[PDB]
Amino acid sequence: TTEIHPSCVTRQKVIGAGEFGEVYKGMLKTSSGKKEVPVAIKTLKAGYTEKQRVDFLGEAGIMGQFSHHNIIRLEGVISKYKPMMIITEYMENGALDKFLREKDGEFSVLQLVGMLRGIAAGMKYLANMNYVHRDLAARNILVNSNLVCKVSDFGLSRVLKIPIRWTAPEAISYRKFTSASDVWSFGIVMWEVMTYGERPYWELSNHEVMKAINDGFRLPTPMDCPSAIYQLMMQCWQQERARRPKFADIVSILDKLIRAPDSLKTLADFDPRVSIRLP
Ligand SMILES: Nc1ncnc2c1ncn2[C@@H]1O[C@H](COP(=O)(O)OP(=O)(O)OP(O)(O)=S)[C@@H](O)[C@H]1O
């Protein structure tokens, strides 16, 4: 990571809150003053514990190892001065789940699939770098003004509480977190994207979600969802982890679909939950 001097960072506005309250949008002066880039700034408030510092700076240490279009860029950190700060590229549309919920129905199928391809490319890179994310969910994807989606929030990532309904069965039960359990999570992210940010499994409790999954039941198809896309998410949810696609398979399949876009016009049947009978 690069150590940034506080004189090079301005905080302009509050853009969201998180674990280490809070997150600002600001500007970062770079290249000895010739360049100026918009940034997000996460701060660690005074009184933090040793664990909190290890987790806070560890996230930046992980992010700083990566250089990929679909992974949030770390500009640098302020650790020599307080409060400590992690400074990342600014993503104008924030978290993907909240963004889609505010854009319900407004994107095309091709656009949604392109977002998933970007996420998959970032995850393929991450897994190939020998990391497991463990917390892959649309809330942890960020979106810029150009609709590019980037993996973020590496607080739980590791080199080789987590929300149950994004987590593969073997990671829930045995704490066996691998790229294959991340593939399960990616399948849930596919469902989140295609539904414009619906809550996986709706009103089911965590125990009810585990009951359904272990009985072989899976999330139903989203409305207006290409058959190939639903088939792919179903494969990500294979009980046996060795049967799930690898991230390289996911990227390749999504690429083939995007480049032959009539392939996305064959839709999976949306199951009529509600019978409305008219003439
Ligand atoms: N680079 C960014 N660009 C724009 N907004 C960001 C950026 N980073 C974080 N945020 C905002 O800050 C929110 C908090 O997410 P993060 O701080 O990345 O995760 P976190 O610190 O683990 O907090 P939680 O508890 O997961 S929301 C994000 O959901 C966005 O609302």
Short mmCIF file of C-alpha atoms and ligand atoms in Angstrom, two decimals:
data_model
loop_
_atom_site.label_atom_id
_atom_site.label_comp_id
_atom_site.label_asym_id
_atom_site.label_seq_id
_atom_site.Cartn_x
_atom_site.Cartn_y
_atom_site.Cartn_z
CA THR A 1 0.00 0.00 0.00
CA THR A 2 0.93 3.66 -0.50
CA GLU A 3 1.01 5.95 2.55
CA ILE A 4 -0.88 9.18 1.81
CA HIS A 5 -0.18 12.49 3.54
CA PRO A 6 -3.26 14.11 5.15
CA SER A 7 -2.61 17.36 3.27
CA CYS A 8 -3.48 15.51 0.05
CA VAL A 9 -6.96 14.40 1.17
CA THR A 10 -10.10 16.51 1.41
CA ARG A 11 -13.42 15.23 2.73
CA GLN A 12 -16.45 16.69 0.98
CA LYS A 13 -19.59 14.76 1.93
CA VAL A 14 -21.04 11.74 3.72
CA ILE A 15 -21.80 8.93 1.26
CA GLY A 16 -22.74 6.06 3.58
CA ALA A 17 -22.08 4.38 6.90
CA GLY A 18 -20.42 1.09 7.72
CA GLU A 19 -18.71 -1.03 10.37
CA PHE A 20 -15.98 1.55 10.98
CA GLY A 21 -18.21 4.60 10.80
CA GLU A 22 -18.02 6.50 8.52
CA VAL A 23 -17.50 6.80 4.73
CA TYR A 24 -16.95 10.11 2.91
CA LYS A 25 -16.56 11.19 -0.67
CA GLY A 26 -13.53 13.39 -1.16
CA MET A 27 -10.63 14.28 -3.42
CA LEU A 28 -7.09 12.94 -3.44
CA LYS A 29 -4.18 14.95 -4.80
CA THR A 30 -1.67 12.69 -6.57
CA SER A 31 1.39 12.85 -8.85
CA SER A 32 2.99 15.46 -6.57
CA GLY A 33 0.03 17.77 -7.20
CA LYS A 34 -0.55 17.36 -10.97
CA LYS A 35 -3.51 14.99 -10.62
CA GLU A 36 -6.67 15.02 -8.51
CA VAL A 37 -9.03 12.05 -8.29
CA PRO A 38 -12.39 11.51 -6.55
CA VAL A 39 -12.17 8.99 -3.74
CA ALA A 40 -14.13 7.26 -1.03
CA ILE A 41 -12.64 7.56 2.45
CA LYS A 42 -13.30 5.08 5.25
CA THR A 43 -12.07 6.15 8.67
CA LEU A 44 -11.23 4.33 11.90
CA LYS A 45 -12.34 6.43 14.85
CA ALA A 46 -10.20 6.98 17.94
CA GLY A 47 -10.42 4.28 20.58
CA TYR A 48 -10.32 1.38 18.12
CA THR A 49 -8.97 -1.89 19.50
CA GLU A 50 -5.99 -3.84 18.25
CA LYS A 51 -8.33 -6.32 16.53
CA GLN A 52 -10.12 -3.46 14.78
CA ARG A 53 -6.83 -2.00 13.55
CA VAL A 54 -5.66 -5.40 12.31
CA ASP A 55 -8.93 -5.93 10.45
CA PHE A 56 -9.05 -2.35 9.12
CA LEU A 57 -5.49 -2.22 7.78
CA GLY A 58 -5.69 -5.87 6.71
CA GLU A 59 -8.51 -5.01 4.31
CA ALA A 60 -6.30 -2.38 2.69
CA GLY A 61 -3.40 -4.83 2.59
CA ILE A 62 -5.53 -7.29 0.62
CA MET A 63 -6.95 -4.64 -1.72
CA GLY A 64 -3.46 -3.31 -2.44
CA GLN A 65 -2.38 -6.67 -3.84
CA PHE A 66 -4.96 -6.48 -6.66
CA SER A 67 -4.99 -4.66 -10.00
CA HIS A 68 -8.14 -5.56 -11.94
CA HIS A 69 -10.88 -3.61 -13.69
CA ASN A 70 -13.59 -5.32 -11.61
CA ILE A 71 -11.89 -4.97 -8.19
CA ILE A 72 -12.07 -1.68 -6.29
CA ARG A 73 -8.76 0.19 -6.52
CA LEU A 74 -6.90 1.21 -3.37
CA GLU A 75 -5.37 4.65 -3.71
CA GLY A 76 -3.65 4.39 -0.35
CA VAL A 77 -3.93 4.63 3.40
CA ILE A 78 -3.28 7.13 6.14
CA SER A 79 -1.93 5.20 9.10
CA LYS A 80 0.86 7.50 10.35
CA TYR A 81 -1.72 10.15 11.27
CA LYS A 82 -5.07 9.79 13.03
CA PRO A 83 -7.83 9.03 12.35
CA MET A 84 -6.61 6.30 10.05
CA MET A 85 -8.12 6.22 6.57
CA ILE A 86 -8.51 3.81 3.68
CA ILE A 87 -8.83 5.69 0.41
CA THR A 88 -10.39 3.95 -2.59
CA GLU A 89 -11.65 4.89 -6.04
CA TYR A 90 -15.03 6.62 -5.83
CA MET A 91 -18.00 4.60 -7.13
CA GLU A 92 -20.74 7.11 -7.92
CA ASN A 93 -23.70 4.67 -7.71
CA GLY A 94 -22.64 3.01 -4.45
CA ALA A 95 -23.69 -0.50 -3.49
CA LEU A 96 -25.20 -2.59 -6.26
CA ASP A 97 -28.12 -4.02 -4.27
CA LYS A 98 -29.33 -0.57 -3.22
CA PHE A 99 -28.69 0.80 -6.72
CA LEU A 100 -30.80 -1.90 -8.39
CA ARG A 101 -33.62 -1.38 -5.86
CA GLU A 102 -33.70 2.29 -6.92
CA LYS A 103 -33.60 1.33 -10.63
CA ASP A 104 -36.26 -1.40 -10.60
CA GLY A 105 -36.95 -2.67 -14.11
CA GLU A 106 -34.91 0.05 -15.82
CA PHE A 107 -32.05 -1.99 -17.33
CA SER A 108 -32.06 -4.46 -20.16
CA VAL A 109 -31.31 -8.15 -19.79
CA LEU A 110 -28.02 -7.61 -21.67
CA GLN A 111 -27.04 -4.85 -19.22
CA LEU A 112 -27.74 -7.03 -16.19
CA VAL A 113 -25.80 -9.94 -17.70
CA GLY A 114 -22.90 -7.58 -18.44
CA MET A 115 -22.84 -6.55 -14.78
CA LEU A 116 -22.65 -10.22 -13.80
CA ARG A 117 -19.81 -10.81 -16.26
CA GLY A 118 -17.84 -7.97 -14.66
CA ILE A 119 -18.46 -9.33 -11.17
CA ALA A 120 -17.45 -12.81 -12.33
CA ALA A 121 -14.24 -11.47 -13.87
CA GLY A 122 -13.33 -9.78 -10.61
CA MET A 123 -14.06 -12.96 -8.68
CA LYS A 124 -12.08 -15.08 -11.14
CA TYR A 125 -9.12 -12.74 -10.56
CA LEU A 126 -9.57 -12.86 -6.77
CA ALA A 127 -9.78 -16.66 -6.64
CA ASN A 128 -6.79 -17.02 -8.98
CA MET A 129 -4.82 -14.78 -6.59
CA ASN A 130 -5.55 -17.45 -3.93
CA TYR A 131 -8.13 -15.43 -1.96
CA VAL A 132 -11.57 -16.39 -0.72
CA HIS A 133 -13.97 -13.50 -0.28
CA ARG A 134 -16.44 -15.23 2.11
CA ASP A 135 -18.91 -12.30 1.98
CA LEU A 136 -19.83 -12.09 -1.70
CA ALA A 137 -23.23 -10.40 -2.01
CA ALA A 138 -24.63 -7.56 -4.07
CA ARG A 139 -24.24 -5.25 -1.06
CA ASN A 140 -20.46 -5.76 -1.39
CA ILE A 141 -20.34 -4.87 -5.10
CA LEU A 142 -19.93 -1.19 -6.01
CA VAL A 143 -21.12 0.51 -9.20
CA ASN A 144 -19.57 3.52 -10.91
CA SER A 145 -21.24 6.12 -13.15
CA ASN A 146 -20.51 3.96 -16.23
CA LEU A 147 -22.40 0.96 -14.71
CA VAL A 148 -19.16 -0.97 -14.12
CA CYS A 149 -19.43 -3.34 -11.15
CA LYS A 150 -16.44 -3.96 -8.89
CA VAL A 151 -15.92 -6.37 -6.02
CA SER A 152 -15.33 -4.57 -2.73
CA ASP A 153 -15.44 -5.09 1.05
CA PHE A 154 -12.51 -7.40 1.72
CA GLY A 155 -12.96 -7.24 5.50
CA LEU A 156 -13.73 -10.97 5.70
CA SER A 157 -11.44 -12.08 2.86
CA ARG A 158 -8.58 -14.46 3.57
CA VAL A 159 -5.71 -16.02 1.68
CA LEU A 160 -6.09 -19.79 1.35
CA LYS A 161 -20.83 -13.57 11.31
CA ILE A 162 -21.37 -14.38 7.62
CA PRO A 163 -24.95 -14.13 6.28
CA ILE A 164 -26.39 -17.62 5.97
CA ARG A 165 -28.48 -17.12 2.85
CA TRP A 166 -25.44 -16.24 0.68
CA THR A 167 -23.28 -19.07 2.05
CA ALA A 168 -22.70 -22.57 0.66
CA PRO A 169 -23.83 -25.47 2.88
CA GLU A 170 -20.29 -26.72 3.56
CA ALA A 171 -19.15 -23.27 4.66
CA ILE A 172 -22.16 -22.86 6.98
CA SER A 173 -21.68 -26.25 8.59
CA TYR A 174 -17.93 -27.00 8.47
CA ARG A 175 -16.50 -23.48 7.95
CA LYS A 176 -14.93 -24.78 4.72
CA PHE A 177 -14.63 -21.50 2.80
CA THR A 178 -13.11 -21.86 -0.69
CA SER A 179 -13.51 -20.43 -4.17
CA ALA A 180 -16.29 -23.05 -4.59
CA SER A 181 -18.24 -21.58 -1.70
CA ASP A 182 -17.69 -18.17 -3.29
CA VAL A 183 -19.24 -19.65 -6.48
CA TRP A 184 -22.36 -20.53 -4.50
CA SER A 185 -22.48 -16.91 -3.31
CA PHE A 186 -22.01 -15.67 -6.87
CA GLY A 187 -25.10 -17.67 -7.84
CA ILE A 188 -27.05 -15.78 -5.17
CA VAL A 189 -25.61 -12.52 -6.53
CA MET A 190 -26.85 -13.53 -9.99
CA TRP A 191 -30.33 -13.92 -8.50
CA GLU A 192 -30.04 -10.56 -6.70
CA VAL A 193 -29.07 -8.82 -9.94
CA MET A 194 -31.79 -10.40 -12.07
CA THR A 195 -34.46 -9.49 -9.46
CA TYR A 196 -33.26 -5.89 -9.00
CA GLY A 197 -32.12 -6.53 -5.46
CA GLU A 198 -34.76 -8.79 -3.97
CA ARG A 199 -34.07 -10.42 -0.62
CA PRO A 200 -32.95 -14.02 -1.26
CA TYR A 201 -35.62 -16.43 0.05
CA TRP A 202 -37.88 -13.47 1.04
CA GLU A 203 -39.47 -13.96 4.48
CA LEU A 204 -37.74 -17.26 5.31
CA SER A 205 -35.63 -17.26 8.46
CA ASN A 206 -32.04 -18.52 8.39
CA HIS A 207 -33.13 -21.91 9.76
CA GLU A 208 -35.91 -22.08 7.13
CA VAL A 209 -33.39 -21.26 4.38
CA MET A 210 -31.12 -24.06 5.58
CA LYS A 211 -34.12 -26.41 5.72
CA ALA A 212 -35.05 -25.66 2.11
CA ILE A 213 -31.50 -25.88 0.74
CA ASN A 214 -30.76 -29.18 2.45
CA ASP A 215 -33.99 -30.63 1.03
CA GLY A 216 -32.80 -29.74 -2.48
CA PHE A 217 -35.02 -26.71 -3.02
CA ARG A 218 -33.54 -23.60 -4.65
CA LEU A 219 -34.50 -20.01 -5.41
CA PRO A 220 -37.12 -19.83 -8.18
CA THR A 221 -36.37 -18.09 -11.43
CA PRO A 222 -36.55 -14.30 -11.49
CA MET A 223 -39.03 -12.65 -13.80
CA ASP A 224 -37.72 -12.00 -17.32
CA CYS A 225 -34.70 -14.18 -16.74
CA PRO A 226 -32.89 -15.92 -19.62
CA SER A 227 -33.03 -19.69 -19.34
CA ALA A 228 -29.23 -19.94 -19.68
CA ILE A 229 -28.78 -17.49 -16.81
CA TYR A 230 -31.09 -19.44 -14.49
CA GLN A 231 -29.40 -22.72 -15.48
CA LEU A 232 -26.04 -21.16 -14.61
CA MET A 233 -27.15 -19.94 -11.18
CA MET A 234 -28.64 -23.39 -10.46
CA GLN A 235 -25.27 -24.98 -11.24
CA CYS A 236 -23.59 -22.61 -8.79
CA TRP A 237 -25.94 -24.07 -6.15
CA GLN A 238 -24.94 -27.71 -6.53
CA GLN A 239 -24.75 -29.35 -3.11
CA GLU A 240 -21.49 -31.11 -4.02
CA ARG A 241 -18.92 -28.34 -4.30
CA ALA A 242 -16.83 -30.20 -6.91
CA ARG A 243 -19.82 -30.07 -9.31
CA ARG A 244 -20.13 -26.27 -9.28
CA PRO A 245 -18.65 -24.25 -12.15
CA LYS A 246 -15.29 -22.64 -11.59
CA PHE A 247 -15.13 -18.87 -11.97
CA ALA A 248 -13.40 -19.38 -15.32
CA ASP A 249 -16.41 -21.41 -16.52
CA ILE A 250 -18.76 -18.64 -15.35
CA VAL A 251 -16.83 -15.92 -17.16
CA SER A 252 -16.62 -18.01 -20.34
CA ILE A 253 -20.34 -18.84 -20.37
CA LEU A 254 -21.42 -15.24 -19.75
CA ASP A 255 -19.07 -14.07 -22.50
CA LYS A 256 -20.50 -16.54 -25.00
CA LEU A 257 -24.06 -15.47 -24.14
CA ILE A 258 -23.26 -11.75 -24.49
CA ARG A 259 -21.57 -12.27 -27.86
CA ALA A 260 -24.55 -14.27 -29.20
CA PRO A 261 -27.27 -12.15 -27.59
CA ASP A 262 -30.22 -13.93 -29.18
CA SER A 263 -29.24 -16.74 -26.78
CA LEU A 264 -30.64 -14.57 -23.96
CA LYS A 265 -34.10 -14.26 -25.54
CA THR A 266 -35.07 -17.80 -24.47
CA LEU A 267 -36.53 -17.14 -21.01
CA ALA A 268 -37.00 -19.51 -18.12
CA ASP A 269 -40.66 -19.83 -17.17
CA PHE A 270 -41.58 -17.50 -14.34
CA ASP A 271 -43.66 -19.63 -11.99
CA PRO A 272 -47.11 -18.04 -11.56
CA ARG A 273 -47.18 -17.53 -7.79
CA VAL A 274 -50.46 -15.64 -8.04
CA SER A 275 -53.43 -16.64 -10.19
CA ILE A 276 -55.28 -13.69 -11.73
CA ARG A 277 -58.12 -14.85 -13.98
CA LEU A 278 -59.57 -12.46 -16.57
CA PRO A 279 -61.53 -12.86 -19.87
N1 LIG B 1 -15.45 3.17 -2.99
C1 LIG B 1 -16.69 3.57 -2.66
N2 LIG B 1 -17.37 4.37 -3.48
C2 LIG B 1 -18.66 4.78 -3.14
N3 LIG B 1 -19.22 4.34 -1.94
C3 LIG B 1 -18.48 3.54 -1.16
C4 LIG B 1 -17.24 3.16 -1.50
N4 LIG B 1 -16.80 2.37 -0.51
C5 LIG B 1 -17.75 2.27 0.42
N5 LIG B 1 -18.80 2.99 0.02
C6 LIG B 1 -20.11 3.24 0.68
O1 LIG B 1 -19.87 2.86 2.06
C7 LIG B 1 -20.82 1.81 2.34
C8 LIG B 1 -20.28 0.87 3.43
O2 LIG B 1 -19.63 -0.26 2.83
P1 LIG B 1 -18.12 -0.63 3.24
O3 LIG B 1 -17.68 0.43 4.18
O4 LIG B 1 -17.31 -0.91 2.04
O5 LIG B 1 -18.25 -2.02 4.06
P2 LIG B 1 -18.06 -2.14 5.67
O6 LIG B 1 -17.07 -1.16 6.17
O7 LIG B 1 -17.87 -3.57 6.00
O8 LIG B 1 -19.51 -1.66 6.19
P3 LIG B 1 -20.78 -2.66 6.22
O9 LIG B 1 -21.20 -2.83 7.63
O10 LIG B 1 -20.49 -3.86 5.40
S1 LIG B 1 -22.17 -1.59 5.25
C9 LIG B 1 -20.92 1.10 1.01
O11 LIG B 1 -22.05 0.19 1.00
C10 LIG B 1 -21.22 2.31 0.19
O12 LIG B 1 -22.48 2.82 0.62
#
